[PDB]
Symmetry: C3
Subunit: 455 residues, 3 copies
């Protein structure tokens, strides 16, 4: 029955590929322009917008975007007369829906839509900073390593929860609890009932993330509080600090851009026959054989742009760079050292100086997510100081004292990688890694990237 899931997962990868090929024909893009990752993002955004229907389920629309809510589109980049031309294309949302379902043989393929949504979330996590959003909710900016999927749409329920990190959940809870503090009628009446049911659902999702009985117990107390306030906000802050040392269980999905899937179907490949699994070597096989191009701004390093895309494709922004450097075979530097900005090109950017280069998406080894010798690496001092702080004042409980005790005695042993040679297609001989101890361990060390809430 495990190969039956591989057939269904391959069936939707086939669907994303079939759709992207039709969109390239529809937009009349050359083979090079079809492999441009900037064009792939625009095509992906149109489907999520067409099926969203202003629900904020698959993406988040601009306030301007809601000027003609029956149409969707974005920038399409073409190479004309030795220069890069940008044009704003528009299609009817009903037309885009028709083409998407047509590529999936009449089906809706909600999973195919979700797949591209998580790929966008992984790209935003690897690209943009979230420290300003943490400060608004009264959080420590040093918890940036807990923000998995913090850019997901507001109403992406089932799909988003699996990818969201502990800090992302505490943020959506603190945001919601602070909204209750203002007006007392928030949690009362018919309207209140629905919001209370979502409150208990979010608390249970976050409870499932924690893998210690003490952390789960404190989340139970927060959920049972019929009228939450500043007391629960402080408990959630404390639980966020524990997540730094006593890490929660967060799922990482390796979602590639649509152009990769499309260019593999164009050659000739039946993902429904061969099957497909996001867990093992299948994503690495596609990236080794892939050919993706990207627009590049002046004073940008195309090797750093490649690391940005390669890391987002593997959902590795929150993993140890010393492990990523071993798998990649090249130093995976922290984000602050990257001479690059977002993959997307803003509308105010000038096209005259824009160039393109080949994205380097290959790896020396491949790895399977494992959540048997193990070498465990220490946390950096900012993580240690952010975790063991603020416990000298305020609320106290038997559960807080128990959690702090587990934090102090925290063992080296969670979301690991089993490294194998590319020639070892069947995962015969696991490779014991040999880390370069001079590289930084956190992708967010000295982070200087753009803030997400800028547009």
């Amino acid at each position: 029955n495990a190969t039956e899931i591989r057939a269904s997962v391959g069936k939707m990868i086939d669907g994303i590929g079939r759709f992207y090929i039709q969109m390239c024909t529809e937009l009349k893009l050359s083979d090079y322009e079809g492999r441009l990752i900037q064009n792939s993002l625009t095509i992906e955004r149109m489907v999520l917008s067409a099926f969203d229907e202003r629900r904020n389920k698959y993406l988040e629309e601009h306030p301007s975007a809601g000027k003609d809510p029956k149409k969707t589109g974005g920038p399409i980049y073409k190479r004309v007369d030795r220069k890069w031309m940008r044009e704003l294309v528009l299609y009817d949302k009903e037309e885009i829906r028709r083409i998407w379902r047509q590529a999936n043989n009449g089906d809706d393929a909600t999973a195919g839509l979700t797949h591209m949504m998580i790929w966008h979330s992984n790209l935003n996590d690897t690209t943009y900073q979230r420290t300003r959003a943490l400060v608004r909710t009264g959080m420590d900016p040093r918890m940036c390593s807990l923000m998995q999927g913090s850019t997901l749409p507001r109403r992406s329920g089932a799909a988003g929860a699996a990818v969201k990190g502990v800090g992302t959940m505490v943020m959506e809870l603190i945001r919601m609890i602070k909204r209750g503090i203002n007006d007392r009628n928030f949690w009362r009446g018919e309207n209140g009932r629905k919001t209370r049911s979502a409150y208990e659902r979010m608390c249970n999702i976050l409870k499932g993330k924690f893998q210690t009985a003490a952390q789960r117990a404190m989340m139970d107390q927060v959920r049972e509080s019929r009228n939450p306030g500043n007391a629960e906000i402080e408990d959630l802050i404390f639980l966020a600090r524990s997540a730094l040392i006593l890490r929660g269980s967060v799922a990482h999905k390796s979602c590639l851009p649509a152009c990769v899937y499309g260019s593999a179907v164009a050659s000739g490949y039946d993902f429904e026959k061969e099957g497909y699994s996001l867990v093992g070597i299948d994503p690495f096989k596609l990236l080794q054989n892939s050919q993706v191009y990207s627009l590049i701004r002046p004073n940008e390093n195309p090797a750093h742009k490649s690391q940005l895309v390669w890391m987002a494709c593997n959902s590795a922004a929150f993993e140890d760079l010393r492990v990523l450097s071993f798998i990649r075979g090249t130093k995976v530097s922290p984000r602050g050292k990257l001479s690059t900005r977002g993959v997307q090109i803003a509308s105010n950017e000038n096209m005259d100086a824009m160039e393109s280069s080949t994205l380097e998406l290959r790896s020396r080894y491949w790895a399977i997510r494992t959540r048997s010798v193990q070498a465990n690496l220490p946390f950096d001092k900012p993580t240690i100081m952010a975790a063991f702080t603020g416990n000298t004042e305020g609320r106290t409980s038997d559960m807080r004292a128990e959690i702090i005790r587990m934090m102090e005695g925290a063992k080296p042993e969670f979301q690991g990688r089993g490294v194998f040679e590319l020639s070892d297609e069947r995962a015969a001989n696991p490779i014991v890694p040999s880390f370069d101890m001079s590289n930084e361990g956190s992708y967010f060390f000295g982070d200087n990237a753009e803030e997400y809430d800028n547009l």
Copy 2:
């Protein structure tokens, strides 16, 4: 009437040059020795000392320096027999005053004295750290980016105030308030009236720096407190933290050393005819055409010494390094990464190992200070954490809550730079910069420079 100001500003630049030429002839310096920036500083110090008359208005004299208060002087460096010789010269302050007024055609030229004072202030800001002075006044050492002109003399009135930053003002206020806490007779008597009038003047100067109505309002409350104490000190600390995010308006004057002005007049240049403006391209033109040399210690990078002087000449220590790197055309590294120390050579240093090199003071572009596409860059995490802290305990108010609300929701839209080609003398086509995002943004990131209070 705008060209009438250019003629008067050119008249004092002519005066500084005429004076420096006379001092080189007076001291019998070679053409190379006249272009040595160590000699330029000594000559500049003698004028500020001659007209100060122990007022602490243009400089700050050593306690030893007041052993013969009728004379002034310093180290003069000459190249004799393949080595650098240092000698201590002494002149009567009346003689130095006579030579200064003779070069300015009998005038006093107070503006010319101020100009060299601000140039010394900009050099000290770019060179020395002030974290120990911040700790003495109970401040956050991470507010080092608010210490513009923190080395200006205490009794430098109107001219110095325009250059002083928000943190410099909070320091001089807290220093003054703590002396009021100690002695109860402070605000009483003739001294009390004067010191209270200076207190209200400093509060209004700092109030003018802030560009939000809420910040100005809190400064009014601090001024109206007829007997200030620890309550106002805590308000001033909070306002300093707000200045990190809601930046004040501080004036930056590009003041070049006297040797540059002197070497331009020596060739033949009438700054009174052509005019001169510190705002536009005139300082960049002088630096492009300039030829300045500097003594250099062992294990010092002459390129890093050049960045130190070039940054001080443009008063850019408190600006974004990614903008300075674009204008300079070369990476403008943070101060911690500079393999250099102060420009001045201490009296205890050994001359045998001393060498000299050519200062690289040229730039790829020039820029005019503007206080129209704009790309806004995030603050580093130490700035964010220093700004949003300490507000959980202690004082709360309608004004404090309003300021924090503006800080949390602060938009990126704080003085910018307008970049132009050197071939674009009339500022026709503005250049949209392309930053290298791998460079650090703060000149004080990982700061390791000497403390200013050591001598």
Copy 3:
């Protein structure tokens, strides 16, 4: 009489060498294998274990190690058939004691045992991080620069105490005071008298470290408290923060591995004739003439492994890297920038990928510890913030206010640098620092935690 101490110190250096030569012959190691620093560490551990007799005086034994407490040993590495072989050797502790005393001409040579113990402490200080142990005792992890000899054995006598830093002493006091808070029979009875006598001894040792009258006075109050608790713990935390700015006086002993001493005696050298002094040029002379090899893991920089050993040999982990870089002649990078791990090889590590390289232990200059132009360097911002914090709330006293005043107004352990050609210390060298280098060895530290094993 100063040359009489040089003769006795040379007498024990000769003993360590005589012993190591006998151990190489006993273990049948080649000349190369005798110069492998991994073999030297194993040999050194066997002597400390044989004479310890489970006292925790010279080392700290593993719980497994106490499965046959009459024997001792460790991993010995040999080069067989182009590969590195590891074998676990075992010897009777009485046999190792007999071989050690025979090399010192029948004497016990406790100083020689202490010498290798301090060398192990210096290596652990330069290698492993102690931030997790700091958090357990409620301390600031930024006080890592105060942890000299924090890995020394529990019952290490006078010699070990002298090497311990201020933060190491506050840790052993807070640990002990927290044990008194829990159980009250602690300060009562025969145990109570002894444990109280050790408490007053530790307080006086730490009092001697401080070199300001105010800091010494606050330690007196901590000692006189007949029943200490959380009040003294907070006083000790405050005194540790003062040590960041008002540094204490801690002794640093340059102890080289036994293979260095052994390889110098093998050639032929009478340390008892020439004498030996850990203070001056003698350790630098040995390192200049030394030839030491080290096993090296994949993706490790042998130049960084060399810096690790050279720094531990000079007990320099807690000194300014800008001074160490001037003496070394090469940039001495912070520990976070080093592409290396511990010198020792764990039992779970695979020998197939292991290689060896030559340790670069030479220096451009030598220096004598001096505790006359002086150039003083600023503290980094984490040190400043860790020192001036927590004084807004809690306990207050005339002594705390006096110490903070001395900290805020504090004016600027030195090194006197000389050329290698200047053996008689004629011309002191005024250093010329590279101001781009980081000043603290622990800046951005990413090394393994000492307690994990």
